[PDB]
Subunit: 337 residues, 6 copies
């Protein structure tokens, strides 16, 4: 085919990027994260008990109002690194940037206050492979490919820096290609270890003038649905010792004055070193020594079979425009602009 | 009749106002919000699972200790804009400022951590109409009227500013009239759209030198149980654009230095303009440009049938002593003092 | 009569105190300072040209929009110790906390950026005497006494300490009496040197253990429209030498840790000693040995006839609740609170 | 017997002290609090629904991986002052500082987000008496005594101050004796009211130069599992009035500048006055008057039969090395170092 | 050609702007300031002795690790208005936001602590002309024009205001064009006095309502490598007298509350008036009457031939987006945003 | 003997270090500074008249309430470099971290507000020699050596850096030895010029690269009771000129951003160079280019016989752990930590 579609994304405190989708007839709209680390679509349901306060604070899909609804009802539970949702499968029409696709999704009826009350978004649109689809449900991108309308069998992510401006675009997902207006230089590609996961070989991680981590190679999950760059607890302990960062419950911090002079961190991928400066990974909220500044690098032990692995989320993608190539099973990176 | 009673209220961070009631024989006491936006009485129950941490941190009604208790047991679920509680109905004797009334109330056994762990109060005394009573339970004020002891069929709210002083009264509810010691000038009255809800016509909302909102009239719910003044998401977006406020997850903020010079907001009700200054709607916690200050105006989409509507909570009532007149179905306002 | 009327006041940084008046049918609402150190009422005009950038940033009165406006047009200039305004005389209903009074006042058309860009208030309500009113315009309080509605022929001021951790009342003016909530004990009065100015005899100002200033007496204006306790340049020079304070560049300062070592300052007024501690006169913006802190006492050379005199502004009034007694031409003080 | 074992503890923000234990074959490790205020062992279970986000963020015991596991399955619910957990009993081998003991513990399958998401620890090792054991399960210390290997039938707690250093030990529990390297002077002992609870008579509590609390004697629970020193709501109101502290939802605060000069608090136990200075009970996070500082003394109404009682947690134990003597039923205190 | 290339810039405290370049095969990545006020490229060397403590704390280039390095060794000294570096000439591939260009540059071996310990950047990329290049080394932009890839023969600078409440972009340089996202309206250009320096004629500098400086004209360097607007010592002395500013010890200051009373400063350039308001030129680090605030205008006596001249640095560029037009030997300015 | 005894110390703002002693049977507990620069013990008395406002705000000793008090009554005056106390001699049991010793000390009855209102401690424990004890009262350490309980005849001081983000130990004094936890490596000792004062020969003070002060030698008192490193007025004048520091009003300051450019200060003591970096001697209260920062070095003209001399106070001791060796009349230093 010959079309491409983009969805404009909103950027929330540099930790959540989401766009809009419509479900049903007439469309009921939802803020959703386009997530390469999962493969299911779900949104909160009108059948979700209001004793789930997260459901009181989000848009709820109501099937009783949709003339295009198709019942299925199979239970499913979706497990993420920072929380779990549960509900049941339904089918309806979903619009994503002017593509209309019939799609099986989850109507979530159990949505925990922690963390979903901290979600600006309502739901999730998984962009992973069917291999990782819970309930063996066909993912939305596979369904869009079937239609034979996308110019290429790929999608791309631009994640902007946060703005205080209204007229700064938070991000952009292009279905069927890439926007050259938001990257420069050439794409450089790495092949997936295996089809089924957006995960690649990483040859090394260095902090300053030393490959002190991933010395014998390791795994990098490229996860548009993760806020941060994460690694294993023990990998991160080492990294954070070297930065002189202190561990809290959920994050690491440094004294704010120390932030700007923290060293570079490089990620060795497919023969190119991908390099973040301090400004790229420190929430420089102040310059005061009497204050604490969060780092956009966390600990997360992703379990087998996907893990143990590093994850390269928004912290990484803000620097590097990312293209997900399904036809050739590879990820490409280019300097974002 | 000829009596009136008042209940002294405590003011918590200007967002929660509550007084004491006694339930049972001997009395088991509870901190409760007197709430014109709902019509049921409830308090937390001894039957509430301690897996509900909100129940571990509040006073629990225990029916086994009350010789005046009368079982009913009908389930009920109470839905508020910021959360839900659930339990079952019971009857017992309730004292409110020296009035003793036999009252059906809810013993809540499901009380979500978010938001009820943020409640300084234990329960709620709904002061709305039977028309909005869940379970068609007679509300406490209707039951008090039946006794034929109140001088007038009205109640009134004084909500003070917050104090660092002990000896500042947080607020006052007068059952059966008004305290002229806490208002000045004359009351000015608006008739309810309909008996059944404490909701009136609002002719316009202006921000500075411009009626930019509610240009063709809209609805104002007068809600002693809401912290803030709220309006529809789209009404508020407009208001907040004009103030130069930025939206966060739950609130809007401005830079603190900008607070004092923010413009007036007026609310056109029954032929009088009701005007708040910045000091009335900004939590001026600092004057620093490197800090964020919350506004006591929020977004809340109240659904049909009551909504879509604005709500005029504590932010408004601190400025304006409010009388609720059931005999003549109207709300009156006067400058608080 | 048997009424009083109160206006709640905003405190800006302990240097500006102001509240709401209404002008016109229907009311246009302005922030004003209630100023016992002048005798005219004025607000900025719609006719104020946009050149003066202080008029773009303050609420403007619009005669065309008031059915009770009555033209006068007479020119007038108002000279304060810090800044001068010119404009013309207008008439209308001014509303001040429940009282409605017909009043002549200034529509200010010349509003110098220096200092009125610093003014958080729009205008000024002069509580001084007719003897000092420019244009011999009957001052507002005189006009309100003529109504015969006020219980006593006095008015009172409470100014509060500024607080970042509470949204307390910044202050209160009570027309027609006093509020026992904001003082303790009983008033002791000092008679005016003469009707016409709120000015009393002072019999000494001591610093710790020695009446080292104003032996042989001096004058004290009690000025609710002034931020500070002022004395003459020479007076304050000697006051600061006694305290160990030094001219930074613009203001006098102390090392913040040494503030609590500074001696009590005592103003001998009508037989009694009125004492401010260092906490009451130094802005303990911080307490460290590494910072400097300013004082709430400044040099002000007031010219004849009113000066040379001390002025007792906000600083003093914060400590001592003040009643201005027009019937008896005296001033009452009582502590706190 | 002749052995003693110690477990090194980690100190988290001075509010949680925990060490490591191993459960199962091969060992599955867990961070646990050694808690004299309870008598059960539990850790989170692999059977805990991932809709409990607290279970997503902690180490989960998985019985399917343990060749030493012994099923029992009896339900149990453990109620603490700040929350509840629920699950069922299992038996397995537990290692604590080189002692290996077969132990019945709780596999928790219900673990509320509030407060368990704020737990750095995974589980709890109750060190109380069988008398208070839920399910009449033999506590771990009783089981260790049975082995006849401990030199003395006692255990001891050292709780360090918090450090920014890695190489500062957070705390230490000695099984079978005391470490003289972490105390000085002599132990001074008080007998338990009764065997069954780590609770003693307290003869008085003084704040400054006045026994204003516990004037006629009261109860002190010595609780290694509580963060703070607590007393009854009414006892604490009085204490906090005297310190000039303000009550918030969960804690009390003072202005930070006021912290260092707050008076001493003494606790009269078995004929010695145990004295904390401000530095011992104030989280001195800043010296600024524009900031709030938490006190490590809270309100908690412990119910019958253990209560009403004061609790002496970490705030007290940091100052005083504590020995728990089971053979002679007593608690001993000595100055920590 | 038809390409542009952009480099995203970090803003440190509104006084240092810098971004990423790569040098060598494979790239070694350094932070650099893009400096229209000089014409050489340099980074610190591996050969830089560890004595100069500024070399221990900055990224060092290592020729031995680059397969595209080509020795030159020629000595060179670079004199800035604040500090001097010496070193030797090297050649390699420098990569600048998607463009790869072969370039001669300085390996700096002498790096004085004063001021380079204060330097958040490693090195400097000179965007000035060959006429002013030490050693007559072809400047990087000239070398990039020679590739014939850039769409136009210009480059542009956006410098942003620093913000603690957002992780916004600190700035952007676009090689080969301009980004309409960061200005509004259209450029107006001023021609260079002569090819060779980014220096234009200035026809007046007014303070409010009077061209009181630079009547009879003066020179203005537009210097992206300077923190401030500078003028000559005498010029700035008279500028500060007009503003009411005073020499603290090192810098000129105003009382923070009086900043908003300061007059607009206007630079008459090419027929148009370029105006900074007080918000644009004063560091409102705070707004209180109790604090002093510094200005973003400093005295700098630049020596011949380039000086004596005004310099328009970051302060100016923050207000006016700047395009440097090499084809036409002129400079474009447009507002904001 | 074979014991040591330690007292944990509170750090107030890096300028006052003090801990707990007990006096009387039963103990009355006072905060004291452990002062190697004086030789008497004193606390404030119950007999101290309430005039001296410093006595109302400090713990007072009450002889009437101690069964081990033994009257002496002899008058004594104690002159420190900053302030003077007078009072009378008393005897009692003083308890100091596990040691009980009978001691003669001062009951202070005259306690000048200047400077003792600034004193966070109640009293002083003189660790100097009998030769300098007013009234030739045996100093406390001598009395403790006479017990023959201490393992070695020395005592040691650890002073910590102040921290807002941790409740760390502020310091530690060890009587009878040293704590390897708070230094690294091994002590190197400097012999006393003579028994009787904790004063050593200094062979030079260099600023960066030049012994520009104290060539031809000078004296150094090692004073645990002084906040700073002091030198003579002339000495410090030349020291500050070399650093670029200037007299603000009261203290010397640097621009906070320029602190890290200041040279190492090195004190040549007993053959070795003891070096403080700028981090160790400047109070980096902030790091901005818009703020000024004070130094922890001050001018102090000490009079004969003890002076003129440098004093090495808290500033020095923070860097170098200090052991005072009474057996060998020398002082040991080791780094950190």
């Amino acid at each position: 085919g010959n079309t491409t579609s983009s969805v404009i994304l909103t950027n929330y405190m540099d930790t959540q990027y989401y766009g809009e989708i419509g479900i049903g007839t007439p469309p009921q709209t939802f803020k959703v994260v386009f997530d390469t680390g999962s493969s299911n679509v779900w949104v909160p349901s009108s059948k979700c008990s209001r004793l789930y306060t997260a459901c009181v604070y989000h848009k709820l899909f109501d099937a009783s109002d949709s003339s295009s609804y198709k019942h299925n009802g199979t239970e499913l539970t979706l497990r993420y690194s920072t929380g779990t949702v549960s509900g049941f499968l339904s089918q309806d029409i979903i619009t994503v940037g002017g593509i209309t696709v019939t799609q099986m999704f989850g109507e979530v009826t159990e949505m925990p206050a922690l963390p979903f009350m901290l979600a600006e978004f309502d739901g999730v649109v998984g962009m992973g492979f069917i291999e990782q689809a819970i309930g063996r449900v066909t993912p939305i991108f596979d369904n869009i490919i079937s239609q034979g309308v996308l110019k290429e069998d790929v999608f791309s992510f631009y994640y902007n820096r946060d703005s205080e401006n209204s007229q700064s675009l938070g991000g952009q997902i292009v279905l069927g290609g890439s926007d050259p207006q938001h990257y420069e230089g050439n794409f450089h590609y790495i092949n997936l270890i295996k089809t089924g996961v957006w995960q690649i070989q990483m040859k090394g991680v260095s902090v300053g003038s030393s490959t002190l981590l991933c010395e014998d190679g390791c795994l990098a999950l490229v996860d548009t649905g993760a806020s941060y760059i994460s690694g294993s607890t023990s990998s991160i302990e080492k990294l954070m010792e070297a930065l002189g960062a202190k561990k809290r419950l959920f994050d690491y911090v440094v004294k704010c004055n120390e932030g700007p002079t923290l060293p570079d961190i490089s990620f060795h991928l497919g023969g190119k070193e991908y390099t973040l400066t301090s400004a790229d990974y420190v929430f420089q909220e102040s310059y005061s020594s009497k204050k604490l500044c969060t780092l956009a690098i966390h600990a997360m032990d992703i379990p087998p079979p996907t893990g143990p692995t590093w994850a390269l989320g928004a912290t990484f993608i803000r620097k590097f425009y990312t293209e997900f190539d399904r036809r050739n099973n590879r990820i490409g990176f280019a300097l974002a602009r």
